[PDB]
């Protein structure tokens, strides 16, 4: 809850990468948990955690698109603190997304 | 010919004379031993000359003398260098210990570099050579010898990248670049060092190399204008494109523009192998 | 005009190469000599230090 320091890891499987869920360790977190990751004073990025056995305790993995978007890198030290959504105001009613050909 | 037999007989006679003189029980014995070792040296009998030098060294050390004993040990080790690297290493280590006790850091560091060179040249052992180079570099840095420490650290980093992990290479190259870039004369070559680190980052992953090159560009504006960063960016584009043909084309274009060190070629071959 | 300028450039480059080679070998020999004198002076200073220490102890024992 208060936040813990950690180092990012690599996504183990393509299926987890597609789901856009940070792959974490069962001993550390649980499926459906929601966190905020700090990389610097002005860099806080929100994520949702999903547990997989392959993740070592004290480590969390992100997909390549996640690393590109949030600027995360393997080997760097970051912080992760559990954050809870306020569904009364933060519920999604209509989300508009830009879609592009991933491969030309 | 006359030289061989005559010098050998004279040296044997001198050895017997010294043995009898010591048997009577002393400086004259040490002088006779040194002369006999010299005659052996002229006779080209490198083997057993170091033994006579060591015997003289012990004979003189018996009476508390340490300086001339250290010099004799160093000379005996140098003589053993060609005859036997092991005995030469032992004698040089003894001399280094004596001088370090006496506090002569320059001589000790030079002897350590000689030990590393003999270890890496004749025998096959780099880790001991790496440790010797590190010891010499620390000794020189204590005596604020910037160039010698930088050279030793650069060689250690090159060896580490060659066989050991890339962390040592990154650290040492970054340190040397920091030390040299601020200096006026060496700044011209500073860029070079930085580039190496970036390449060593490409060995682990492309993202780490990209971040490292961005950090280098931000720290060093001229690094942006260098052709080397342009080549690295083109190589990065090729790798993200999974196109070995572009990699080969860029490498050959660079080779035509300028010749290679044969180490950059090995690193680039390793990088291109893992493109898959 | 091509021949004159090209040959002039080649002559200058060749002269620079030759003189740089010669002076580099000269610098190497100079380095060897200065290393030899360095060790010689180190040995001389060490021996004079030892000799003066011996003289001091001897005279103090005798006086």
From Swiss-Prot, chain A:
It is found in: Cytoplasm. It comes from the Eukaryota. Homohexamer. Interacts with GABARAP and GABARAPL2. Interacts with GRIA2. Interacts with PLK2, leading to disrupt the interaction with GRIA2. Interacts with MUSK; may regulate MUSK endocytosis and activity. Interacts with CDK16. Belongs to the AAA ATPase family. Required for vesicle-mediated transport. Catalyzes the fusion of transport vesicles within the Golgi cisternae. Is also required for transport from the endoplasmic reticulum to the Golgi stack. Seems to function as a fusion protein required for the delivery of cargo proteins to all compartments of the Golgi stack independent of vesicle origin. Interaction with AMPAR subunit GRIA2 leads to influence GRIA2 membrane cycling. This is Vesicle-fusing ATPase. The lineage of its organism: Eukaryota, Metazoa, Chordata, Craniata, Vertebrata. The chain holds residues 1 to 104 of 744 of the full protein.
Curated annotation (Swiss-Prot), chain B:
Keywords: Acetylation, Cell membrane, ER-Golgi transport, Membrane, Phosphoprotein, Protein transport, Transport. The modification N-acetylmethionine is found at residue 2. Interacts with PRKCABP, and disrupts the interaction between GRIA2 and PRKCABP, leading to the internalization of GRIA2. Found in a complex with VAMP8. Component of a SNARE-like complex that contains at least ZW10, USE1L, RINT1, STX18 and NAPA/SNAP-alpha. Interacts with VTI1A. Interacts with STX12. Interacts with GNA12 (via N-terminus); the interaction promotes CDH5 localization to plasma membrane. It is a peripheral membrane protein. GO terms for cellular component: glutamatergic synapse; neuromuscular junction; postsynapse; presynapse; presynaptic active zone membrane; synaptobrevin 2-SNAP-25-syntaxin-1a complex; terminal bouton. Transmembrane segments: none annotated. This is Alpha-soluble NSF attachment protein. Required for vesicular transport between the endoplasmic reticulum and the Golgi apparatus. Together with GNA12 promotes CDH5 localization to plasma membrane. It is found in: Cell membrane. The modification Phosphoserine is found at residue 183. GO terms for molecular function: protein-containing complex binding; SNARE binding; soluble NSF attachment protein activity; syntaxin binding. It comes from Rattus norvegicus.
Swiss-Prot record, chain C:
It is found in: Cytoplasmic vesicle, Secretory vesicle, Synaptic vesicle membrane; Cell membrane; Synapse, Synaptosome. There is a cross-link at residues 56-57, 60 (Glycyl lysine isopeptide (Lys-Gly) (interchain with G-Cter in SUMO)). The keyword Transmembrane applies. Its main location: membrane. One of its GO terms (biological process) is positive regulation of catecholamine secretion. Expressed predominantly in cerebral cortex, hippocampus, cerebellum, adrenal medulla and retina with weak expression detected in non-neuronal tissues. Belongs to the syntaxin family. Part of the SNARE core complex containing SNAP25, VAMP2 and STX1A; this complex constitutes the basic catalytic machinery of the complex neurotransmitter release apparatus. The SNARE complex interacts with CPLX1. Interacts with STXBP1. The interaction with STXBP1 promotes assembly of the SNARE complex. Interacts (via C-terminus) with KCNB1 (via C-terminus); the interaction increases in a calcium-dependent manner and induces a pore-independent enhancement of exocytosis in neuroendocrine cells, chromaffin cells, pancreatic beta cells and from the soma of dorsal root ganglia (DRG) neurons. This is Syntaxin-1A. The gene is Stx1a. The chain holds residues 197 to 259 of 288 of the full protein.
